Amino acid sequence: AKAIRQTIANLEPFMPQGMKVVYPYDTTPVVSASIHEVVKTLGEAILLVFLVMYLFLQNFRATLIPTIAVPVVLLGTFGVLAAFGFSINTLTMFGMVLAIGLLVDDAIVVVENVERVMAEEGLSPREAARKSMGQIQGALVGIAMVLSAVFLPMAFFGGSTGVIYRQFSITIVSAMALSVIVALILTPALCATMLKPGEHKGGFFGWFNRMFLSTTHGYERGVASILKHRAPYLLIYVVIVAGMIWMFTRIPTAFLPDEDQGVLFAQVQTPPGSSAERTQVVVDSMREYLLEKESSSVSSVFTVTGFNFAGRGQSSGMAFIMLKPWEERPGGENSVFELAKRAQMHFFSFKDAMVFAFAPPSVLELGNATGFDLFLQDQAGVGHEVLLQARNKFLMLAAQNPALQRVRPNGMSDEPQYKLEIDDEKASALGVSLADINSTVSIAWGSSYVNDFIDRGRVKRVYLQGRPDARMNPDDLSKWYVRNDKGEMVPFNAFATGKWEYGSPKLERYNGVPAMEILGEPAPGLSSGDAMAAVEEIVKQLPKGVGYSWTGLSYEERLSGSQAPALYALSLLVVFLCLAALYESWSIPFSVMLVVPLGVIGALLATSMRGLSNDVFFQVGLLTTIGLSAKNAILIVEFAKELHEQGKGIVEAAIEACRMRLRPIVMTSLAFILGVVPLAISTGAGSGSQHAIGTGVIGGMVTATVLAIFWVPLFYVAVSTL
């Protein structure tokens, strides 16, 4: 787009008088506004996390340590994804926004560790740094192995889903590995330079910290009802897991949510066998409607007659509609989908033409509309009319099917066409040779091409055709005379009659055999597998001799299969293996392996009551939710088992570990809340992507942290003691 605008800037001073160049249709400002919106939400997420840590802790020179460790890991993520050759898009920026919490947690861990040892001994940093590095040096490479095992095996998949998950996988694993090495080399060597060995502060913020300590003490005497009631809660746990397994059938599965683009298409198609006047009337009335009745959300209507995306002809049209930019149409009633719905009911009021108004999909490169497509082809040579009847049967049986919505032919129907029959023997008996008849017909109607000619510095071409008044009706196919073999003139009335017959104006083929298309889209609630299965019930009632074949994205989603159960099975298996690596035992890491459904319940509930379907962003949100809930529970279980093997009981070491760990766990949980909020409720370009990948993460992590922080030591004791 930049090179095209530069070429028009180099060609603009040589315009003639009053020659303006305008841009009616353009799909680049949605890309620019989307990347600007995700880098802006990155900026305010970093600003809100800094503001929360500076207002809640009231100390600047310890908050300075993660807020300088975040741009290092960010720019390192940029460089690492640039080393493999991957582009900055919405997908890697979503990876960075979801990796903010997983990179800030480690800096918070090492800063709180040096604060704790500073409060405990206050001695020289060398040997105490050796000890603190001895604790956290194994822990950081342990969580690197854990989060690599839980997130990296989505990279080993093929297809469109395989490319999307390898973008997310290497983005999160790159930010993880950069966070590990940057924390290990930098954050002790940055917290060990310019600090002070804060306590007993005056007025209102110190009393608020006393109130926070009082709520911690209230937690300390509120968990007694959990610890004494040791039996009951496991049946509630089984209820939650069974609700999760029930809930995976409720939310429908898709590929990627239909985003806003600022682009609407309209497909004009008159009752065919029509001229250009009727199509021009329907086109001009559509332009008048969209310009005087809906000028609040439509900027410019570039209407082309003769080139809808079905086919070409004299009886077709198309209006390239560019909507206003997103600062002039706020509110959910002026989106492209509500404008499409409010325009379609008025396009049904055009009693002349069949007008269908559709919006393009999310990824423009995949196709040109939303939903599925399939090419109904033949194999045996059953006949073009039999195949057209079979396509009409398919269309009516799908329009009566409650699992489909607005199935289309994406083609033109049979219309009158004038078959003139040259009386062969009578023409050749009267004397005229047949090559003269064919030359007369082809040049007099088919607009023959003779040679070229130059003009004004450019070689253009010369055509040759009859008048606009001597080919317009079958009475004017008799004005043309063909020369005899002796200088006489023979009309076309002598040897050419006329019969009106039947045929389609757009003939299609697919894999070397004739075909017709069927375009459409599934129901607003149903998945893509249900539309697939409904087509599989409609095709079974077709005649013998035809056969379906899928095209486009449908070819991938019908031939590849679904490797998401294998994804979750392998990912949870190898993260269990890295937990048994971190803990050196076999029965202990089940107290973190078991936590996963209690994590994903919040994502399932939050994408249920918001109406956000299952897509790739929902599964990325589930994986990061599982990873952060496990990353909190392993610090709980690891430091509890470490204080158990230092020579104390199970429950007492668990209680002192969890009380010492509640402030960083809830702190990084609330920081990741404040990170993921300004894209889950945002309004602008790239809406539905941000809504899905924010809503799943916020719901899952908000229930996961403050319910696992109660329940992880419960079944930790239940699987270590019993």
Partner: protein, 201 residues
């Protein structure tokens, strides 16, 4: 060994901001787009045979070309289309991750042996083989303000002055003008073409 890497804090400052500096250079050396390579590399073979029918375009050009699209590596499905005004397309779609220039080489190699079997007019119209994806990127549309120029004036201006420097830029693989250039039409009056014992031949 150990103390050469632990005792020096600004050594860690330098390593962290060399990572930041390589990140800044890699930001200003990367592309920006919206989604990665999802759709497979298509290739279209389109020509406009004027004054024809749907059956004429089909059984003279489309079947003759696609009977020679055999023996192409990494091919997924071939799908063609022939309209009524005389224009057509074969949309060959390859597998994801194939190399589009070697792909265009193979498709052009397999249709150069079907090109001499075509009609002479189909050859003289100029067969275009482009590798571009299915969407319209942007429409450059010129508009006269005063009203002293009609539709085909502006279409001539596009095809004669905008189209030729714009189709060679870095990124544009296929174009489509909404109109046509000028071409010196000659309208045969069949009464006067009758008067002098002459034919259109």
């Amino acid at each position: 060994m150990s103390k050469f890497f632990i005792d020096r804090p600004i050594f860690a400052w330098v390593i962290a901001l060399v990572i930041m500096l390589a990140g800044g250079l890699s930001i200003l050396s990367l592309p920006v787009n919206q989604y990665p390579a999802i759709a497979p590399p298509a290739i279209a073979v389109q020509v406009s045979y004027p004054g024809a029918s749907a059956e004429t375009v089909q059984d003279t050009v489309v079947q003759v070309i696609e009977q020679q699209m055999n023996g192409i590596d990494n091919l997924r499905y071939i799908s063609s289309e022939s309209n009524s005004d005389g224009s057509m397309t074969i949309t060959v779609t390859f597998e994801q991750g194939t190399d589009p220039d070697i792909a265009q080489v193979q498709v052009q190699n397999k249709l150069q042996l079907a090109t001499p079997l075509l009609p002479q007019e189909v050859q003289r119209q100029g067969i275009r083989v482009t590798k571009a994806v299915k969407n319209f990127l942007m429409v450059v549309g010129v508009v006269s303000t005063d009203g002293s120029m009609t539709k085909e004036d502006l279409s001539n201006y596009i095809v004669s002055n905008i189209q030729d420097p714009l189709s060679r830029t870095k990124g544009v693989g296929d174009f489509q003008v909404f109109g046509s250039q000028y071409s010196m039409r000659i309208w045969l009056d069949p009464a006067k073409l009758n008067s002098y014992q002459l034919t259109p031949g």
